[PDB]
Amino acid sequence: MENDPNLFVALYDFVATLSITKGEKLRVLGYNHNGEWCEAQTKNGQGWVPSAYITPVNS
Ligand code: NA
Ligand code: NA
């Protein structure tokens, strides 16, 4: 499915900033300067998540 380009999925659990669970869909709204941190929105709120822990859904 073509998804929002800022729709990401968590690759790993990440615990706080936003806590995410592997497989969780997140909406990335923003990056820090180098994009290693994402201001992301999930079903649980917004906060920073590391890019290293997430990946865009689209391919
Ligand atoms: Na991806
Ligand atoms: Na794909």
Resolution attained, angstroms? 1.6
CA distance 52 to 44: 20
The letter for the amino acid at 54 is: I
Half-sphere exposure of 17 (CA within 13 A, CB side): 9
Domain edges within the chain: 1-59
Q: Give the distance (Å) from ligand 2 centre to CA of residue 8.
A: 11
Distance 57 CA to ligand 1 centre (A): 5
What the block records as the tokens of 49 is 């998540």
Quick one: CA torsion of 39, 3, 54, 44, rounded to 10 degrees?
50
Is the CATH number of domain 1-59 2.30.30.40? yes
DSSP letters of 5-32?
Answer: TTEEEESS-B-----B-TT-EEEEEEE-
CA of 29 to the centre of ligand 2 (A): 20
Q: How far does residue 49's CA lie from ligand 2's centre (Å)?
A: 21
Ligand 2 centre from 40 Cα, in Å? 20
Gaps in the chain with C–N over 2.5 Å, residue before each: 16
Report CA torsion sign: 22, 4, 31, 18: negative
Assigned token pair, 48: 């920073």
For this PDB entry, the determination method is X-ray
Return d(Cα 52, Cα 43) in angstroms, integer: 20
